[PDB]
Every structure is written in structure tokens, then in C-alpha cells.
């Protein structure tokens, strides 16, 4: 049997403290179901590593949000890569992969790790600053749209869009359709900028359209594989360098040891993506009648996995709820896990690495000296403002 609760996830006061909550799913059962949404939920860690790692049974080709693709016309064309299953989506995988490949990185970290030490320098040169605004939106902004070989007129797009994307695939809630509403103008630009003419030379755009003559993707699907990065690119990394700042700014002995070994810095952002989980939720869709959990769930069911819990969950983790940068952090779920697991995820440790790196080397201290604002999303968990004096070390 089943337990039925009427959580709603995707309610501002769920966002507002998810916590006791997911405490609340992980300990009702292995499965549960949201009277609420109508969808079964998974909030443990080995249920939704299980789903996440059986695509055929738990399928992304219906939508990876609330929406069922078999019930409902998508708010935007399918994603190749997100919204595909498998054989369909190895190929675009693959490009992906090798567009954001450890090569790619070798070519870009030298100027990834000199924006963020610019940027930490000018902060500190402010002293008082908005963590959200001046570092996680300032520094992504500073380095992505640029390695994507976007033009500079219309940036302002990237992250509105991006909310929108991550909203969209929430339940029909204010902010979903709020954020549909508005969403005209950002899609515009969005789709324009993914044309060949428009990525300049050597970036990851100008790369995907190069990789149209393999055999693995055609020209006309470029387009969108841009549109993949341009939609998860920013925004996702965003949230977790922010959530690394609040971690480091709430838990002032992690941020000690990072400073003493700058060497750190990469888990000390992996477990900021664990401890934060900015990527709160994804669904699935299921393609057959399937035991789970001892539940037996049927076909064409939406299955919403909740990763962030799956990520404090005490099953797999000892103590979860606490902020460590030293923790053997392999095996969270924050980048989700199995065949479509985070393809960007080189990138955003890159970025996170190098800007917990500048931190680690020329802050003493990071200390909340302001209203934190959190920022309401149906997807993405993180701030709107989170304002800081940093005392250079
Ligand atoms: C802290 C930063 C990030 C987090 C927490 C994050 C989280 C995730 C998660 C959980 C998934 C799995 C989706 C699923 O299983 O349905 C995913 C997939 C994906 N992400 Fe990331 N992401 C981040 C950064 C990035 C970056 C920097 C890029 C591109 C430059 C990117 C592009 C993608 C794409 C294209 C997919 C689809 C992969 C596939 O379906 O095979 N993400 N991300
Ligand atoms: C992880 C978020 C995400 C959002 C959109 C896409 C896509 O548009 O393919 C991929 C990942
Ligand atoms: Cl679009």
C-alpha cells in the first residue's frame, strides 16, 4: 500500500523551508503519491537513484516535468537531449559531450579561473556586496555566454529564459503560467541565438553546429542542442556557486578550511551542489507497469524524484544536513545520475572550482549582512539576494 499525501512540492511554503517536508516523504514510504499533483514521488536516495537509472521504465520522451507529452503539446519544441530516451538520445549526448569535453575545458580554465579572481578582487574592493547579483549571476555571466560564442547585445535574456525553463516544468501553478506568460520575448531571442551565424568562432556553439557532418547529429538539430545549453547553462550554476557562497557564508569553519587548503575548492563545490541541490526535482514517465519500491505503479504515471532530498536523505548519508567540504560526496544525485546525467557538469565544476578557489585564496571572511532573499522556483532552489561584507584575507 501506498501512502497518499497532500504535500504540494511546488508550494511557496514548501520552497520557502523544503526540509521537514521531504523528511516528511522519505519517512511516509519508498513511494508515495501527491494527491495534490496527482503523481507518485520518490524522496529517498535509493529510489530515485533506482528511476533515475532505469530509463526505459522511467522515460524522459513524455517530459521531464509535470506535463505528460502523450496528454499535453509541450510549451516549447522537445529538447534532444533532455526530453529524449535512448538510441534517439545518444547521438546528440555524444556531441554534447565532446562539445563540453575535457579539451575544451583545458582551453578555457586559464580564463574561467582569471575571471573569477577579477571578480573576487572587485568585490572585495566593494567590500559590501549582493552574493546573488554581484558573484553568482556577475561571474557565470562573465565567462558562459562568451565560451558559448554569444553576441553581446541580448544577454539580458539568458537568465529570465532560463527561470522560465525551469519553472516550465512545474505543475500549472502561478509561477509556471506567470512564467509562460512572459515568456515571448526570451524565446526570441533564445531560438535566434542558436543559429551558425550567430556563435561566434570557436565557441560551444560554433562547436555543436561544427559537429552537424558525423553522422551524429544533422544541421537542423544544432539549433536546439544550442537551445539545450542556452536553457540549463547559466541558470544551474548560478544557484550552486550561490549556494556554495551561503554555505560558505552560514558554515564560517568550512569556509577556515577551505582557506587553509585551496585544494578543497572542487569538493568544496560539489558539496555545495549536494547540500544545496539547486536542481531541486525532475519527473519521469512510466512506460510500463512497474514495481518500485514494493508499490506497484502503472503505465503512463508521472514519477517526481526528488533529488535534493534524495540528497539529505540519513539512508545514505551521515549527517546530511550538515555543510562538509571534505565529505566523500561521489554518488549525490545533484547532477542527477545514469545516462542523463548533468553533460554540463565539467563546466559548472569548473566554474565553481575556480571561483570557491579565488574565494579560498583572498577572503578571510564572509559574513551575512543583510535581508536574505530566497528566489521561488518550481525547479531551481536559491537565492534572490544574499547580501555579505567580505574581509580579504
Ligand atoms: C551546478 C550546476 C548544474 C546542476 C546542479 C545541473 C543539474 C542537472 C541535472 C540534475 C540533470 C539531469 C536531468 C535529468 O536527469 O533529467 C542535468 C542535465 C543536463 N544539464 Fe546540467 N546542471 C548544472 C549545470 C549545467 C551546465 C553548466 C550545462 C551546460 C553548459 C548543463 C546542461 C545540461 C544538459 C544539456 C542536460 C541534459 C543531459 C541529458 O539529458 O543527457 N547543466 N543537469
Ligand atoms: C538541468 C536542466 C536542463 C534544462 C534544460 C535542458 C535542455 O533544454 O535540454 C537540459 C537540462
Ligand atoms: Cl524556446
Not at 513511494?31 to 522515460?59: I, M, Q, S
Amino acid at each position: 500500500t501506498i501512502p497518499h499525501l497532500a504535500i504540494d512540492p511546488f508550494s511557496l511554503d514548501f520552497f520557502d523551508d523544503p526540509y521537514p517536508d521531504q523528511q516528511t516523504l522519505r519517512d511516509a514510504g519508498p513511494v508515495v503519491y501527491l494527491d495534490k499533483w496527482n503523481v507518485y514521488g520518490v524522496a529517498r536516495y535509493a529510489e530515485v537513484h533506482a528511476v533515475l537509472n532505469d530509463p526505459t521504465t522511467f522515460c524522459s520522451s513524455r517530459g521531464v516535468g509535470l506535463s505528460d507529452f502523450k496528454k499535453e503539446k509541450p510549451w516549447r519544441p522537445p529538447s534532444l537531449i533532455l526530453e529524449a530516451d535512448p538510441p534517439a538520445h545518444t547521438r546528440p549526448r555524444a556531441v554534447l559531450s565532446k562539445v563540453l569535453s575535457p579539451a575544451t575545458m583545458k582551453t578555457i580554465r586559464d580564463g574561467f579561473a582569471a575571471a573569477a579572481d577579477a571578480k573576487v578582487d572587485e568585490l572585495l574592493q566593494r567590500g559590501c556586496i549582493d552574493a546573488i547579483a554581484d558573484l553568482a549571476e556577475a561571474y557565470p555571466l562573465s565567462v558562459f555566454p562568451d565560451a558559448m560564442g554569444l553576441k553581446q547585445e541580448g544577454r539580458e535574456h539568458l537568465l529570465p529564459y532560463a527561470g522560465l525553463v525551469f519553472n516550465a516544468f512545474g505543475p500549472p501553478n502561478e509561477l509556471r503560467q506567470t512564467a509562460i506568460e512572459r515568456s515571448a520575448p526570451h524565446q526570441a531571442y533564445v531560438n535566434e541565438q542558436c543559429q551558425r551565424p550567430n556563435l561566434a568562432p570557436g565557441g560551444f556553439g560554433a562547436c555543436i553546429h561544427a559537429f552537424t557532418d558525423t553522422g551524429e547529429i544533422t544541421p537542423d538539430e544544432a539549433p536546439l542542442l544550442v537551445r539545450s545549453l542556452l536553457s540549463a547553462g547559466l541558470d544551474a550554476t548560478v544557484n550552486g556557486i550561490g549556494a556554495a557562497v551561503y554555505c560558505l557564508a552560514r558554515f564560517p569553519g568550512e569556509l577556515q578550511r577551505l582557506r587553509s587548503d585551496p585544494t578543497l575548492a572542487r569538493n568544496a563545490f560539489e558539496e555545495a551542489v549536494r547540500f544545496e541541490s539547486p536542481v531541486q526535482t525532475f519527473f519521469r514517465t512510466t512506460t510500463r507497469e512497474v514495481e518500485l519500491g514494493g508499490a506497484v505503479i502503472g503505465e503512463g504515471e508521472k514519477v517526481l524524484m526528488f533529488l535534493g532530498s534524495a540528497n539529505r536523505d540519513p539512508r545514505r548519508w551521515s549527517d546530511p544536513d550538515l555543510y562538509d567540504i571534505t565529505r566523500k560526496t561521489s554518488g549525490h544525485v545533484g547532477f542527477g545520475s545514469g545516462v542523463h546525467m548533468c553533460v554540463g557538469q565539467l563546466v559548472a565544476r569548473l566554474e565553481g572550482e575556480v571561483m570557491l578557489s579565488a574565494l579560498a585564496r583572498k577572503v578571510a571572511a564572509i559574513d551575512i549582512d543583510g535581508p536574505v532573499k530566497r528566489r521561488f522556483n518550481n525547479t531551481l532552489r536559491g537565492l534572490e539576494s544574499l547580501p555579505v561584507k567580505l574581509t580579504p584575507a
